[PDB]
Amino acid sequence: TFTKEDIRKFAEEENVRYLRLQFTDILGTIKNVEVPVSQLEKVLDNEMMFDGSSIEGFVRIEESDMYLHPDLDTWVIFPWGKVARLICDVYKTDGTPFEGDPRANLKRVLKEMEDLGFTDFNLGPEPEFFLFKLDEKGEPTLELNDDGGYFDLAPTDLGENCRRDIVLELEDMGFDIEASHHEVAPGQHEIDFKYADAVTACDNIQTFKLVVKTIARKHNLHATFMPKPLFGVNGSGMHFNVSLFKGKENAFFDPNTEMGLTETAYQFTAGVLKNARGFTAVCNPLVNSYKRLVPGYEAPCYIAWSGKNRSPLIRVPSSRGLSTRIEVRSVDPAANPYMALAAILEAGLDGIKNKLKVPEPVNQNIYEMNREEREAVGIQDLPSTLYTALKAMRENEVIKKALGNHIYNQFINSKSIEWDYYRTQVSEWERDQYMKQY
Template sequence: MGKNYTKNDIRRIAKEENVEFIHLQFTDIMGVMKNVSITIEQLDKALNNEIMFDGSSIDGFVRIEESDMYLYPDPNTFEIFPWGSPNQKEARIICDVYKSDGKPFCGCPRNVLKNVLKEAEEMGFTMNVGPECEFFLFNTNEKGEPSLDTHDNAAYFDLAPVDLGGNARKDMITALKKMGFKIEASHHEVAPGQHEIDFEYDNALTTADNIMTFKMAVRIIAQRHGLHATFMPKPKFGISGSGMHINMSLATLDGQNAFYDPSNDMQLSETAYYYLGGIIKHAKGYTAITNPTINSYKRLVPGYEAPILIAWSANNRSPLVRVPSKKGNSTRLELRSPDPSANPYLALAATLKAGLDGIKNKIEPPTPVMSNVYIMDDEELLEKGIENLPLNLYDALKELEKDAVIKDGLGDHVYNRFRDAVLLEWSEYSKFISQWELDRYLRKF
């Protein structure tokens, strides 16, 4: 995307393009996008970081007595929405959240990622990320409420006429391109109603912004087609869930791929191996962040291509981390566990922190797994020292509590608020009686 806007550029473009409303966007700790909407007359005030909001009204931000927060817009994220009326255009700018004393707010996920990226930069690296974001398109009823009925019965890579969501997906791609996205691939996924749109890799901060923008655009365009787009990890029993694979690499500050080394079999550099070592070592610790909902763990089960075991491989898709075959400037690691309910800023901060710890402490990765880990029995897994990812959100939180490195990457404020939110969610879930339990036990006992 690589824009380099000044404040004057934004003023000029907004005037030329008849922009009437501007949405100042930021993200809460659980990854929900928030908006403070202003009219064009308030644009100068916004660009001078003078727009404030009540932080105590945002989940997990602050207490009432410290509630005044300021929005600092990032000019490079200025984007005009390609939908809406030509005479009254709407635009957005993504903002960092600051406190009233002019310091960055430690509970702002974008600031959390910036801090870990600064740590990487001090070690001589930048992080590049290419996400693969899956989602479902479901029909809506006459009230516009989502159902679990899909609009198609297409399968992986199917084309129209069976893939009725194809038109919606085409419009999504058109809208995203107008907003500066470079789309690499788009296809129907394994399950009915499931789609994937991949966009070009970029630096980690831009990619996290792009994931938030992508989710918003997909939902809005789906709605215009009478469909409901959901990034819920596993909306239906018995079919594949939606993942958000993260393809990541480090580059040196002069732009060279730091993971590539043509001198060995795998063509991976020592930096890449140590980074991988960190990703494997801290896998249990960051899972609560990359898979932050109760529902996330319904996807991480055997039989549906989602990883459940902490292992890596170059030649099969079953383990947690895969090393794709393309090398040179494309050398990267693909982390396959994250799902699209994750807060992208925190997910990238946590995984980068894990990888940097690997580099700092020269953590060697385990031996790669060449066979399909799905078909290994417990004895073989034990012998190879291959462990499971946490089985549920509560277990994942317990693992995060034990991982000082990942907690340090998040910072105390985000960690504590995240933990509180997860414990509340777990407590609600634990009390709920599901249809499965009624079907199973009502007549039996």
């Protein structure tokens, strides 16, 4: 926690000369307003004005005027005078928070969750990213930074070792890193965080993306969170380990049952499974995202839960006690953390307050099953394209309730425009398959 006096003291002792008022849009892009430190007081008075329509992304029409209200607890100084940042909420000219701000939407969802008796919603993300080599002109190529495998000690200590530098710099900034390892695909890396509250977790995800992209550029590399940059290799996921708490106590832990899961946890996973098609578009917002949702690369392709399976939509880790959690594995690093977390929490709460019955967990004898038999058993498939994902999202009420009307409509319009632009392109695959056979 910080106050105005703490911020002034930090600016004075650390010789901060630049301030970044940081926020996000509906597409998850990290936006910021740059300010000289001489404006610090005006920053602390919630008097900084900006367009505000930039939150709409590429579907903005008219310039508005909106105020930035910094959150003093998000204060941090970058290790590169010095530059400091503050994460700010967006307010309208009438003093009320802007309904199109994902952070405010997540805060509203958490506040409405608190009326159900729960106090905290903790998230631990597992973001995976790719590192590509840069060419002479400074553009990213398709060559990977290394050639390691799953949990390999591929980047040696002598040389670049971008992952180690990223971890150390995040530790210096005040982050809580659990562990890091090399991912399955060459040039793919994963850094894991300790669990934190929802808003703090999403802020940490945004800051982690920014820090990774900066440090990769320091090492003459390019960091990408693209869900599927390369065909034929593993994609990048952002698995969300979530846990509910109502007062110094995990609501998912059952200390008496051998399995160790309460009825609340079963209702939560049932609700997430019920509305999985509804929030797939939000959790997988890019056209490329659905190139990751293909079988054989551990990404989930159908709606099921298990404790031990190759690619379940929901996985329950063997940890118990205060660390019991539910892992949603459909999220990719390109998704907006606030919107995806709000959608997942809303689906879980919808399952909780409807007392839904969780279906049977899947086991090893599902690998031999076509889609027809899978549907006969009751296992629905995730949408395979962004078009069908938007079609499914337009038919779900829980996702609309989670997002709010403004964010829901803007996201649908943006994604429809993006798909419309994508669908008219003639791909090289078509020119290879056709143009000689026809």
